[PDB]
Design a protein around this ligand. Structure first.
Ligand SMILES: [Cu+2]
Ligand SMILES: [Cu+2]
Lengths: 78, 273
């Protein structure tokens, strides 16, 4: 089963998640409407191209870690 | 070709290494290494095709990727070889590695920007071009997201593991490869990426020149594992969907197999092994 979708404003940025040279991702995340590449690991944790080496439990947690890392910078399309 | 511990380089060797790296960057060659790495980081998956990491070929793939990079450095200055960073020994922000004559230090607290050394954005010599966000400056936060680098004792606990890799040959595996990569256990390679922070913690991690030194030490640990376990070898050995078996070729090169890369001494030796 895919995780549920989400939509919130986190640290002033809109983060959204939804079930759907880069893999064919079963789930999509956006930060202010720009897609963030995310990936699920076998144990159910998530990572993203902004924070690839530090797994977090959910795609919303990956979106929030990306906003934390970006420190206000716009994401670029991948 | 001798790969030497970074800590041991002379002033002249540090100067020549930095100059060769900066010339690869100037000429445009450096950024295509960053782009190739990113393409595999984002495409390898635990449930499908996987080559450059989360998989048994993590080690031979990086051994060939690092040989491609070293050969490019040698095309600029034939005296330069890739040094390695023993993060179990050189484990603080005060290490010589992070001095202004070598890689520069940590980033400032406001935006993570590295402010000193040859790779600082202010030099004009290290634009971050292959990137996932607008920021074009090298960033680091040494020790920011995780408190400590691995210790020698932790490294030994991984070197003691006899199986090279195990089914399902991905981030859930037991065995040496996945414990050195760090998805399970005390965590060696992934934790170093998290510890450096900045671009090293992202899917464009070769943007920091420390990438190469980190992976040259991971490559050395594979060599040490081999000497610990002369009876153990690369697996799988044939017929495994989505995974590079011993005698299958690896993308992107297509002309080399794990088997061609098991013996590093065909290409270089270490200062000590
Ligand atoms: Cu790595
Ligand atoms: Cu023996």
């Amino acid at each position: 089963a895919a995780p549920e979708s989400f939509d919130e404003v986190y640290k002033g940025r809109r983060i959204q998640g939804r079930p759907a040279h880069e893999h064919g991702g079963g789930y999509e995340v956006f930060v202010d409407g720009v897609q963030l590449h995310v990936m699920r690991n076998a144990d159910g944790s998530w990572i993203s191209v902004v924070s690839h080496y530090d797994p977090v439990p959910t795609p919303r947690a990956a979106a929030r870690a990306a906003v934390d890392e970006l420190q206000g910078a716009p994401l670029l399309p991948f | 070709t001798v790969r030497k511990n970074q800590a041991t380089l002379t002033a002249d060797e540090k100067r020549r290494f930095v100059a060769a790296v900066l010339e690869l960057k100037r000429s445009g060659r450096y950024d295509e290494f960053v782009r190739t790495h990113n393409e595999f980081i984002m495409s390898d998956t635990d449930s499908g095709e996987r080559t450059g990491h989360r998989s048994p070929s993590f080690l031979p793939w990086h051994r060939r990727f690092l040989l491609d990079f070293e050969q490019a450095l040698q095309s600029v200055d034939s005296s330069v070889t890739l040094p390695y960073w023993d993060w179990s020994a050189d484990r603080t922000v005060r290490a010589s590695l992070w001095a202004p004559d070598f890689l520069g230090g940590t980033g400032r607290s406001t935006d993570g920007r590295v402010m000193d050394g040859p790779f600082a954005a202010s030099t004009g010599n290290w634009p971050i071009n292959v990137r996932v966000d607008s920021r074009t400056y090298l960033r680091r936060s040494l020790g920011g997201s995780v408190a400590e680098l691995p210790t020698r004792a932790e490294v030994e606990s991984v070197l003691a593991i006899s199986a090279y890799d195990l089914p399902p040959y991905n981030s859930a595996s037991e065995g040496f490869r996945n414990h050195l990569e760090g998805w399970r256990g005390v965590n060696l390679h992934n934790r170093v990426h998290v510890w450096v922070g900045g671009q090293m913690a992202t899917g464009v991690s070769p943007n920091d020149p420390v990438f190469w030194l980190h992976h040259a030490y991971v490559d050395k640990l594979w060599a040490e594992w081999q000497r610990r376990h002369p009876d153990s070898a690369y697996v799988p050995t044939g017929g495994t969907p989505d995974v590079v078996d011993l005698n299958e070729t690896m993308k992107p090169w297509n002309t080399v197999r794990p088997a061609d890369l098991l013996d590093h001494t065909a290409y270089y030796t270490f200062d000590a092994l």
